[PDB]
Paper text:
The zinc-uptake protein [name] is expressed under zinc-limiting conditions and was originally discovered in [name], where its expression is under the control of a zinc-sensing transcriptional factor, Zur14. Characteristic of other TbdR family members, [name] consists of an amino-terminal plug domain (residues 1 to 147) obstructing the lumen of its own carboxy-terminal pore-forming domain (residues 148 to 734). Combined with molecular dynamic (MD) simulations, our structural findings suggest that [name] acquires free zinc ions using a series of binding sites that move zinc across the outer-membrane through a transient pore that requires TonB activation.
To elucidate the metal transportation mechanism, we attempted to capture ‘snapshots' of [name] in multiple translocation binding-states through co-crystallization and by soaking [name] with zinc or cadmium ions. The transition metal cadmium, which mimics and competes with zinc-binding sites in proteins, was a critical tool to stabilize and identify two additional binding sites. The metal ion captured within the high-affinity binding site is coordinated by four conserved residues (Asp-99, His-100, Glu-340 and His-499) located in a buried pocket that is sealed by the plug-apical loop and extracellular loop 6.
Residue numbers in the entry: 18 to 286, 298 to 734
Write the structure that this text describes.
């Protein structure tokens, strides 16, 4: 048969949808952003060997959506690229990269791509021969990676299946070229282990089943100076701190009139290796039967509880505690067709209790994110109408968000007394309404043309609302904005796809217009003495809002002169611009007049550089499958406020695989050679733009299906 996406109960399908095989992924880098890097329109936001996030059409974090088998990952990778994404592509069956109204099934504000990682955790069928699974192993030079992985499915009778799976990865600091005196990049080592046990029913009509997962990651933080260890931010008026007084314990309640616009900044005045120790424990239940009750063709439910935490450490000492407890429930049903129009409607409840707190030195109370509770009540659905060779699908999502914070009312009344009226203290409630509409014309099949559009509202996160702390790994001190508005977006894309024996291609053109776009506004610049002297110095930011305009293009094209050979060209390009920046109050004059200074439109931070790809593939024969990949990464000269130019490199990759069969199972050998040119690889779209990536690496690996 053929690859079919699972993310939607109702199968929608644009021509830019892309399904990556798990078989392909067993030979790919472990972290999601690395694994996906190289797919047209996808770059990486790497942060050492420990983490990389996908950057899709210039977007990342809360403007895309990573899914662990239809479920919330529960991690804190939206917070900073510092933090690894809790999915395992090396243990995956499939990674589906989807565009269109399907995104509305899972979130509001996803404008670039839904990335769903599907797993074997809960079997869904029964294994041939009663047992099935695979075993995997690979080594990588200058990495120095050792990766072992395995999984098993066993029938406990006629309609019961147990699944186990696990992976361990060990890697040291990666080698780097010409980053002198240094053979390897310090603090870039990364170790990870995962395990899962599942147990499920069998159908028809479908399945019910549960699974438990457990993951430990331990990895260094590269380029981590301690110089800001003994530093705090002054951002609120001293006077305001003396009078409001609640801003000493709860500084997230500040308003614009509390910000010191004269001389805000850092006042300065744990000798161990920087690293992150992260633990994620997961309990879930999946279910899907094929004729629930009359009028509906399918029913799919999903329950999840996820315990996430991570310590940011120096030696054996913890500097920062990160915590995120997640519970998520979703019910989707697909109605029986009414009249060549089909539909899936669903409801979702999502609760996230999170904090990001410093170790109690204390050094004064400035919580990056105080303990907060966010609840998402979401109603959503998609409907597709079919006029034969033309499909038209619409999507909607209405989610109400309640952000609550547990105050000590208690101390606040007493500490404040009089004279001052206390702020709202109420729960922050907002409601997003989003719609999508998409048209697919299969004219002259197999020839697909999609036109997709959406108007989406993204609810501000508690990080964006209530941050008031220092996060060294991103070189920023984050201040939230308690009354942000919803990010509004108007999104348009046209995709064209062809596959015809000799030629294959996929082309896409997109534009994303915001819409009260939320962005980090640097304040500690061009003001008092605490303002920055250098571009590299730490930024004191407060979240603000403006217009934004992203547009770009991406594509691939392959030609097969012979069933043996395939030649290809790939490419992508993306522009991101901040428009309509708000005017900010400047220095107070000698007459006491503080003027609003206007800031021009400027470039978006860490937008990927253009990239061209050249590709060769050839089976020779039946078993051996050689391949060559030459990427031309161009320099990035469209720079945001404090960014520097990024080169600009030549990525040459060689590969080969040996397919060989026997009793029980299949033997997939592979040999890979990365960065043969040993070039200085820099990713403008990462927080470490000027730190080189892996110099040059040899990989040998085996996978054994059975
Ligand atoms: C199922 C466990 C068996 C795994 C052993 C793999 C065989 C070789 O691996 C040795 C692992 O450790 C070796 C130490 O170095 C790791 C990477 O090697 C670089 C040394 O040149
Ligand atoms: C068949 C080869 C598989 C070898 C990979 C090792 C898999 C072992 O890991 C699974 C067990 O891991 C449980 C989760 O990790 C432990 C985290 O908590 C304890 C601290 O390590
Ligand atoms: C629409 C892609 C296939 C092209 C064949 C023409 C389809 C005939 O109907 C055109 C209406 O299609 C609606 C497409 O969805 C709206 C996209 O733009 C929304 C902007 O408001
Ligand atoms: C709601 C289903 C139909 C989706 C189309 C809604 C409108 C989205 O427009 C798509 C085209 O994008 C640009 C539209 O421009 C009009 C307003 O744009 C400026 C917004 O800042
Ligand atoms: C199928 C291949 C056709 C390309 C599809 C669109 C991909 C875009 O590729 C264009 C890459 O162009 C290189 C851009 O050059 C550097 C960018 O900076 C120039 C601005 O001064
Ligand atoms: Zn962090």
């Amino acid at each position: 048969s053929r690859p079919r996406a699972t993310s939607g109960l109702l199968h929608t399908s644009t021509a830019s949808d892309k399904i990556i095989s798990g078989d392909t992924l067993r030979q790919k880098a472990v972290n999601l952003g690395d694994a996906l890097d190289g797919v047209p329109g996808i770059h990486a936001s790497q942060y050492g060997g420990g983490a990389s996030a996908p950057v899709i059409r210039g977007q990342t974090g809360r403007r895309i959506k990573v899914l662990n088998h239809h479920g919330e990952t529960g991690d804190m990778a939206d917070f900073s690229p510092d933090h690894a994404i809790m999915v395992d592509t090396a243990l995956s069956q499939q990674v589906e990269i989807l565009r269109g109204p399907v995104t509305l099934l899972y979130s509001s504000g996803n404008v670039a791509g839904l990335v769903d990682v599907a797993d074997g955790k809960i079997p869904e069928k029964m294994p041939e021969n009663g047992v099935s699974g695979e075993l995997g192993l690979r080594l990588s030079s200058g990495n120095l990676e050792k990766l072992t992985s395995g999984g098993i499915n066993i029938g406990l009778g006629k309609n019961f299946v147990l699944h186990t799976e696990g992976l361990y990865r060990k890697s040291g600091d990666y080698a780097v070229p010409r980053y002198r005196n240094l053979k390897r990049l310090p603090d870039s080592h990364a170790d990870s282990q995962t395990g899962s046990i599942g147990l499920s029913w069998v159908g028809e009509k479908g399945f019910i089943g549960v699974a438990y997962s457990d993951r430990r990651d331990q990895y260094g933080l590269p380029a981590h100076s301690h110089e800001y260890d003994d530093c705090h931010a002054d951002i609120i008026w001293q006077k305001s701190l003396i009078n409001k007084r609640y801003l000493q314990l709860y500084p997230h309640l500040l308003t614009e009139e509390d910000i010191d616009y004269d001389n805000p900044g850092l006042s300065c005045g744990h000798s161990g290796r920087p690293w992150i120790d992260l633990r994620n424990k997961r309990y879930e239940l999946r279910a899907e039967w094929k004729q629930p009750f009359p009028g509906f063709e399918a029913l799919r439910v999903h329950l999840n509880r996820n315990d996430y935490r991570h310590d940011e450490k120096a030696g054996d000492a913890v500097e920062n505690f990160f915590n995120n407890q997640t519970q998520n429930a979703r019910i989707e049903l697909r109605h029986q067709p009414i009249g060549r129009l089909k539909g899936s409607w669903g409801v979702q409840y999502l609760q996230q209790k999170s904090s990001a707190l410093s170790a109690i030195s204390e050094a004064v109370k400035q919580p990056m994110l105080l303990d907060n509770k966010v609840q998402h009540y979401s109603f959503f659905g998609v409907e597709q109408a079919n006029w034969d060779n033309f499909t038209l699908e619409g999507g909607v999502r209405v989610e109400k968000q309640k952000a609550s914070i547990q105050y000590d009312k208690a101390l606040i009344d007493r500490e404040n007394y009089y004279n001052h009226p206390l702020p709202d203290l109420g729960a922050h409630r907002q409601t997003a309404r989003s719609f999508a509409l998409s048209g697919n014309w299969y004219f002259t099949p197999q020839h697909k043309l999609s036109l997709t559009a959406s108007h989406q509202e993204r609810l501000p996160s508690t990080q964006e609302l209530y941050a008031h702390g220092k996060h060294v790994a991103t070189n920023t001190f984050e201040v939230g904005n308690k009354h942000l508005n919803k990010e509004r977006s108007n999104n348009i894309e046209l995709a064209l796809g062809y596959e015809g024996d000799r030629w294959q291609y996929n082309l896409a053109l997109y534009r994303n217009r915001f819409g009260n776009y939320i962005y980090a506004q640097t304040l500690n610049d061009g003001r008092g003495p605490k303002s920055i002297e250098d571009d590299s110095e730490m930024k004191l930011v407060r979240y603000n809002q403006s217009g934004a305009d992203f547009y770009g293009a991406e594509g691939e094209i392959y030609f097969k002169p012979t069933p043996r050979y395939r030649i290809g060209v790939s490419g992508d390009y993306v522009r991101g611009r901040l428009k309509n920046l708000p005017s900010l109050p400047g220095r107070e004059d000698a007459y006491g007049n503080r003027p609003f200074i206007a800031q021009d439109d400027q470039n978006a931070p860490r937008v990927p550089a253009a990239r061209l790809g050249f590709h060769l593939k050839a089976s020779l024969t039946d078993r051996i499958d050689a391949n060559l990949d030459y990427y031309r990464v161009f320099a990035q000269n469209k720079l945001a406020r404090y960014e520097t130019r990024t080169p600009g490199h030549h990525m040459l990759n060689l590969g080969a695989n040996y397919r060989r069969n026997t009793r029980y199972g299949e033997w997939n050998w592979y040999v890979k050679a990365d960065n043969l040119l040993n070039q200085s690889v820099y990713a403008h779209s990462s927080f470490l733009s000027d730190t080189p990536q892996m110099g040059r690496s040899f990989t040998g690996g085996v996978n054994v299906k059975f």
